[PDB]
Every structure is written in structure tokens, then in C-alpha cells.
Design a protein around this nucleic acid. Structure first.
Lengths: 46, 271
RNA sequence: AGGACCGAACCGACUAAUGUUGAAAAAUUAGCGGAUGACUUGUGGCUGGGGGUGAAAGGCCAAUCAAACCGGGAGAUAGCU
RNA sequence: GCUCGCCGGAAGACCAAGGGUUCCUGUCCAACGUUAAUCGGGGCAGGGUGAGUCGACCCCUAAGGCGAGGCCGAAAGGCGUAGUCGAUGGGAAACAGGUUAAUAUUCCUGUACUUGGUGUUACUGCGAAGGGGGGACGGAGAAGGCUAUGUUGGCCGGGCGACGGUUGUCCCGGUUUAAGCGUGUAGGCUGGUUUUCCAGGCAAAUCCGGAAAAUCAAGGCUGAGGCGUGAUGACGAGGCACUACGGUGCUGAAGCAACAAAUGCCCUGCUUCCAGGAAAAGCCUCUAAGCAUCAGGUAACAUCAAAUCGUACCCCAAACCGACACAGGUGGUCAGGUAGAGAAUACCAAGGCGCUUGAGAGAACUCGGGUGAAGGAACUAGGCAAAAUGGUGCCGUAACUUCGGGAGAAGGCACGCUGAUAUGUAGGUGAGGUCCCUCGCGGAUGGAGCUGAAAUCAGUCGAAGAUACCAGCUGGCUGCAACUGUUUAUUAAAAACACAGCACUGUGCAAACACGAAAGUGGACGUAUACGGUGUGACGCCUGCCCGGUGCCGGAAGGUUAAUU
RNA sequence: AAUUCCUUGUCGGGUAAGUUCCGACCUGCACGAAUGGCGUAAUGAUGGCCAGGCUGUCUCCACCCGAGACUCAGUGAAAUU
């Protein structure tokens, strides 16, 4: 059975990558929230 | 020519084809071709704004000259070509100076026929002149609505308009819809009728033929549940309400013209 | 020539048995339908929640859909246990 | 190590995606492995990924994204121009052999090729953010010519048989060699060459397009494969000396022909059809502004440069997606033998595996199968399930029908093996020889050799010859839907949805309509033979009466009637 | 009748026996003409019905071949309470 998660690095970076987050005001707020929480990994970049 | 396919299988029984041997059996004129990507009926927001559009065969757009402003230069028809972008056929015409262009094919235009445009052109099919010089009561097509912007009326397979009167700077025309409309007596029109009259006689014959044209299936609405359509719902086939669009407009006589900007060029709207 | 015929790949899911703390949160086995087309498939792209998409079942929208998910208003309110 | 069994259009081989050291070596067995474990994709340590030619980067663009100004919007922000990004597409070049425990078209040997920089020499009109050409494109079908590859013969080496025979028409193995360069063939496309002229290609143009003459027919382009060279080489079954029986030096014979033959190549071709089939750059040309004893351009030679990143390993799976070492899912490439129409199926080759608890016993019962006296649907909601039919050829085939069908209707007959016709026929393939020739990869004749159905006649074995796997049950009446299709991923596949066809109605283009506070976008680069909405649902015969109600479309006197005053 | 409550309507066909099926009848509870009427060849993993063939579906089960169940060694769950 085909499962929901079909990995693709290009699609992963384009959808949730660091530059994608920085491209919009709401995405930048996501980074600010994660920085405030002290996340070790800000995004899925690497 | 209208030819009925033999019923060798269900799907060909009711197929009626319109075969025109005069059409060029080769590639079109490359310099006058352009890319034409399909939209699926979706606008720049990505939302479906027109339903039942999608798929179909890939098509290349032919740059058809609807203005016909090359006055004083005879042109000879080279061949008749099939145009996927419209119901009418197009004609490749070569001017005396060496320029080639695409025009809508009139009724009786063949290869080697001579055409011209301007105020001194002869009154014969395929020629384009301002309606001021066109004799009243004649049949024309590819009619301009504002001088110099290219024809917009009577461009379909076998359409045409008739000049009924010419009072002053305006000429009254009877359109295929039956509307009596008047336009400035400076708009260019082409003599004759667009020649593909048999185009209306074709019978697709099967669902797939419509899909080739790029038409997606239409879901009625009485089978849609109330959440999706005003007609939806009911145990069985009920439909106990006045016919209506999606979004709630009547569809059975309710007039929707609310322009009011022109309101002078209409005389005998229709019917 | 064909939304033509028989039939593998491929795409489907009509019947039965098994399984039902399963090998598997829908599969296996034996049959079954389509199989040049309104076909199928890889990669990338677009449409966002009273919105999308829907050959229309209220189907589908990340194992969740008669209004997704996450956080917040929030210790909603509960004449009921 | 010897047997046995299993896969072999994979359960083999090579990749992308994804993973990220799982790769190799040594060492360890606590935990992990559904058991033990000396073993492991486990622990620990070390080692391992070598590129001008492969890929990425890079140049070019598709859908689409972003978007200087700009337009629009309470703010956030939306759209979009010039531009700039974006492969799943276009764009220069390397092959064979050898080699490591683990990498190689990357290292080594041999032999090649591509794009740039610089310098010398010779001859010269060079120049683009512009013009033109090219790149550049669909589906289906049909052969013809080929190769991959296979079979047989010949050749070379070895063998003479655990049990009757086996020096022969016998047995086993091998019989391999690339890119590049030269030749330009089967075949495809197109008439060339010179001169003059021109409202076109935003200006220009010798280029493209167009026009008018003169002269010749042979000009050019494209093109698989073959052949030659590459190659006095490499490889090569086996030997000969060391040989820790783990392997290394040296040597190493034959290395041909015929036939068959692709879904691969010629072919981005040809034929045909309608639903009419990307873009841009590289590349080839044209000139403008400009520079011309310069600069630049072309050719030859020499020299230099070609960076950077990826390269291990799994990749239909124990390493990816499924919480698992999970009967699931996962795109591309390679495609041997016998039988066969076949990539079905059976048995096999190369290669890879026996699926990480076993050992006994031979109760009920359950699961998956085999057979069955007599009967033969009496079972049951229902022939559920099972059984049965099953191939090729010939004969034969009803009602009805839209004349296509129904139809493989139904039904009947023949199928093995051996010999002969014919020491292998019809057919296919085609050597030598001869002749012709614009003397070449040519044409005609020619038939050796090879390959090879089908049929008839006769004989013959068995219970059974389409013997296995494989492989339609058939017919009669009737409801519904015309049909092929679509649907409740995960209890409903249907009479439901679509459908071609039909009708009503809206819509004159800045269209109706739709998404948007708006700009704008779709509709459509369409224009009433068009487009939207609604109902009906092939086709045939038809579709009657009613406008009081509700809606819709018109109308005009009169009544009533908002803000405002 | 995919529509008929009364109802297994009545008659005929098929069966030894037919609330189903087929053909007529018309007393249409409560068909009816594009939310179409009536026909219709072909088509259908569609509904109903009848035949030939076929059979362990059944009368009525018997035997056999394998995988479990049972015993030994190793590992070692669950719902519930």
C-alpha cells in the first residue's frame, strides 16, 4: 500500500526550507517562534 | 464534404465527419506560429472560473490577421489550412512584396485567388474595405467594431452579417444572432461569408470526441446534494424548485445584459 | 480504420475462502474487468478550510472530513454523570 | 566440500528517487537478531569513494515562482512590466583491456576525441541586446535493409568412458576484440547554377521572402550497417617454473563460415488520419551603429588550460515508504536455451537463493489440496463453492438486426510417431563461375551450400496424441441502462454519475458568467456554426390538454409608494 | 409494472407440485409522454427465471497428501481481573 509520506528532498526544501520560510511574513514568524522556543533545528534545510 | 462513418463499432455508428480535401496536408507556416498553453479554465488565482475546460489536444496558435490593413497590395491565396483554434479554416496569402499572412477563409476562396484591401479594392469575396465603400445590402464578415482594431463579428464557421442601412457616419448591420446593430462607417469588413458552412453538420459520435476538444463532462446539478448546488437533494428525482444556475440565477429567461454603456448601437436586440 | 476483439506487462477490484490480539490499521490465495485509450505512469508545478477539487459518493483535501490540521480566546458552557 | 531443492521478463544484473557508511578488513557476543550463534545490515577499531570526456555545476528555456518601477488595496498585502529564477526537456568530447580485500568509461596500458586562452605564420571586412535560417517536435500503420543475439557447421584443444555399446555422422570446451579514423552503401529528402529587379523581414543587409530572364541536368544534404584500419596488439581453452595450495612471472592453439533474427538501429524516415501535434539557447548566416597600414575574422603549427562538487553501499529491498530484519508499496535500463503466437506457461543457462526456532508424533478439529461406489442441485435465499468447457485447421452455424453484427452462435471431423512422395518438397537465403560496366559496397545470369514449412499416402504404439503447464461452459425467456467509460481510498461498481444526441435559455464582446474589497485574470488571443447555465440522455416512432397558482418575459392608463423638499 | 395496498389478482405456459418467472386480462389503491412515453440490435464482473453439460452442493459422508493442533528443547505475548 502506498503511504502518505513519499520523500523528495527538492519538494521538502521548496515547501519547508529556510528560504521558503523567509520569503513571507508568516514564514518569518515561524522562525521567530522557533528561535524563541530555542529549537536546535530551525527548519528542514539539512 | 459530410461523410457518415460505418457502424463497425459502438462509438463510430453515429460519427459524422466533415472532410475537406482542399485543406493543406502538411505543417503550417512556422513564422506565423506561437505557443498556446492550456489553462484548464483556471485564472491567475488558480481557481476554476469556467467549468468543463481541461485536457484536449495540444494546439499551436496561428497569427491570423484580422485587421487587413495592407492596402494597395494584391495578395494571392497559396493554400487553405486547418486551424485548431477556430471553427473556420484559414488561408495562407502571399503579397506581391513577399509578405505572407493568415486570413479567415471566405466561402468560395481557393488557391490562386487574388484578394486586396483598402478603399479602391474590388467588391468581390475576400476583399476588405471600409463599410462606407461597401454597397448597402451586401454580405460581409470579420467586421470591425471600432476602426483599426481588427474584425470581431462574424468570425465563426459559416457566419456573416448584412449591411441593411447607412444613414450618416454609422451603418446598421444584421448579425447572425438577429440583432440589429449600428457601427461607425469606417470599420473594415470582408466581402462574402466565412466558408466552413458544413462545420455545423459534424456529429462527434462519442464521449471521447468531446474530450479531444478539451471539454470536460458536465454534471447536471439535480444529482449534487444541496450543499453543492441549489438543485441538489431529494430522495430520488425531486427537483421541486425553479431552474437556477450555481450561485442562484434563473437560467430560464432571466436576461443578464446590464451594460448600459453602449445602449445606442442596439436597435432590434433579437427575437 | 476502431473510446474494435482475445490476451501478458501495466491499471483496476466482481465473487469466494483465509485472515480479523492478521504477514498486512483493507492484505493473501484461486477466479474476475480494462488492456491504442474518456488509457496508464515518472518528475516538477497550481488550486486552502464555509474554501479547494469532485464523469457527483457528501467523495477526496497527509491512516482524520455534513466543514482538515496546529496554536490561541480557554479553566468555552455542561439545570447532566 | 559433495549432494538435494527453489527463482531465472527474477527471488539475476545496472541505476534514479530515498537512505547515508549499511561498503571492505580485523576483532568482540552483553544488548540487538522472534531460537543457538563462533555468524550479522549488531558493538569497537582501521581502511575504502581518484574524471577535460559519466552526473551535477554551467548555457537555454516549459508549466510555474519571484518581481525594479508600475497599477491596486484600511495595514498586512494583491497583481504584474522590464527582468530574474525554475527540468521532468535542448546544449562540446573516450573507448577496449588490465588492476584493489573494498573505486574505476575516474587508477594503469594501448588508442582517441571536445571546447577555450596565448603565441607565430599566411590570407582577409570585422562588428548585435537587431533580421533570417536551424534547433523544432502528434497518433496510428506498413513493409524493406540491418545489427544485438542465437543455432549449426568448420577450425583448435582435450576426451575414449564406474554398467551393455562408444576411433565415430562420437563426447566436452573455446572459436572474443571497442571508441576513433577512412570508405559513404541499403535507403530518405530536394532540381541545380548565373544575372537583374522589388510597397516585405520596425533601420540596414550580399541573408530570408517575392518577381523576371539565361543555361545544364547532375548538384547537394541526410544516412543504419558492412568493409579497411585501430590490432605484428589485447583477450584466449590449456601449459610451463616458483606455487604459505591464498596465487603470481613466462608461454598460450583455433579465433572462420552459413543460417535464423528482434519490441533495438536506418526512422526526427515513409504512408495515412484528425483530435492538427513546447519554448529558448548553442549552432549557421545577414548586415546597423562603430573600427579599418589597427581591432577583429579564417586556416595551419606550437603551447597552455578544462576548475569545483558527486562517485563507497542497498536500491521490487532486511539499507527507500509501511512503528518491525513487516507475505504490502516503489520509476527507468538489460532480456540466453528447449517447447511456444508470445515479455503467457513449463523446465533450464549466467547468476542468485532454501525465505533466522528446530526435533518428534501421525488424535479430534481447523486450514490448503487429491480421489470417490450409486444418484446428479434432491443442497441452498441463490448452482455460493466446486466440477466442467478450454488449442489449431476444415466443415457448419438460428431468431433478431441499426446490415456492422448476433458468431468462436450451436454442432461435427481431424491432431502422436516412422517411412515415402522429396537420400529435405514448395518457399527463403545465396557462394563459385561466366558476361556487362559511368571498372564500385555495381548490374545480369548462375546455381553450390545452408535453412525449411504444409499436405497426401502407407505403416506403427498406447486406455488416452490440442496427452504436462497453458487453455471460452453453452443455450432459451425477461427487467433496467443504449454503448466504451466514472463512483462511496477502507462493507454499496449499480438501474447511480459521464456520455454522443436533443431542447430551452442567457450572451454583440470591455460578452454573459466566474475568482477577486480592487487592480486584474479566466471565458478567449475565442466572436452567435461562439460561449455560459439548465433539463433530457444513442437510435426508431413520438412528445397530447392546462398560463388559475409560482417564476420568467413584456405592457401601460390608474392606484399605492423611499430618501429628498 | 423497479410503480398493484387488497394479492400468492384471474387465466394460460413451464413443474409430480411454481408467493418467483413468462404471456395475456385491466378492477392503473397510487403509469403516462424531455424531472420524457413506448419500442430497440449490440453491449453488461447488472436484476429475475428456465434448460443441457457438470459435479462431494447434497442423500452421506470415506480415504489420502501436506500446514497447524499434540509431545520435547529454546524464546516468549494479549484482552480481562
Amino acid at each position: 500500500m502506498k503511504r502518505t509520506f513519499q520523500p523528495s528532498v527538492l519538494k521538502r526544501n521548496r515547501s519547508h526550507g529556510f528560504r521558503a520560510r523567509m520569503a513571507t511574513k508568516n514564514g518569518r514568524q515561524v522562525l521567530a517562534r522557533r528561535r524563541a522556543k530555542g529549537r536546535a533545528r530551525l527548519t528542514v534545510s539539512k | 464534404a459530410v461523410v457518415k462513418c460505418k457502424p463497425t463499432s459502438p462509438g463510430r455508428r453515429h460519427v459524422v465527419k466533415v472532410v475537406n480535401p482542399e485543406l493543406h496536408k502538411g505543417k503550417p507556416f512556422a513564422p506565423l506560429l506561437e505557443k498556446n498553453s492550456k489553462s484548464g479554465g483556471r485564472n491567475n488565482n488558480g481557481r476554476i472560473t469556467t467549468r468543463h475546460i481541461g485536457g484536449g489536444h495540444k494546439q499551436a496558435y496561428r497569427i491570423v490577421d484580422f485587421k487587413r490593413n495592407k492596402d494597395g497590395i494584391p495578395a494571392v491565396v497559396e493554400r487553405l489550412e486547418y486551424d485548431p483554434n477556430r471553427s473556420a479554416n484559414i488561408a495562407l496569402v502571399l503579397y506581391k512584396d513577399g509578405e505572407r499572412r493568415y486570413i479567415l477563409a471566405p466561402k468560395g476562396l481557393k488557391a490562386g485567388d487574388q484578394i486586396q484591401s483598402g478603399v479602391d479594392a474590388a467588391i468581390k469575396p475576400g476583399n476588405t474595405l471600409p463599410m462606407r465603400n461597401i454597397p448597402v445590402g451586401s454580405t460581409v464578415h470579420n467586421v470591425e467594431m471600432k476602426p483599426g482594431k481588427g474584425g470581431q463579428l462574424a468570425r465563426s464557421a459559416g457566419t456573416y452579417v448584412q449591411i441593411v442601412a447607412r444613414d450618416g457616419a454609422y451603418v446598421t448591420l444584421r448579425l447572425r444572432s438577429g440583432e440589429m446593430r449600428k457601427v461607425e462607417a469606417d470599420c473594415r469588413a470582408t466581402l462574402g461569408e466565412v466558408g466552413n458552412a458544413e462545420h455545423m453538420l459534424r456529429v462527434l459520435g462519442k464521449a471521447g470526441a468531446a474530450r479531444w476538444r478539451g471539454v470536460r463532462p458536465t454534471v447536471r446539478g439535480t444529482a449534487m446534494n444541496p450543499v453543492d448546488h441549489p438543485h441538489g437533494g431529494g430522495e430520488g428525482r425531486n427537483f421541486g424548485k425553479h431552474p437556477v444556475t450555481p450561485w442562484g440565477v434563473q437560467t430560464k429567461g432571466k436576461k443578464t445584459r446590464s451594460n448600459k454603456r453602449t445602449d445606442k448601437f442596439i436597435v432590434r436586440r433579437r427575437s
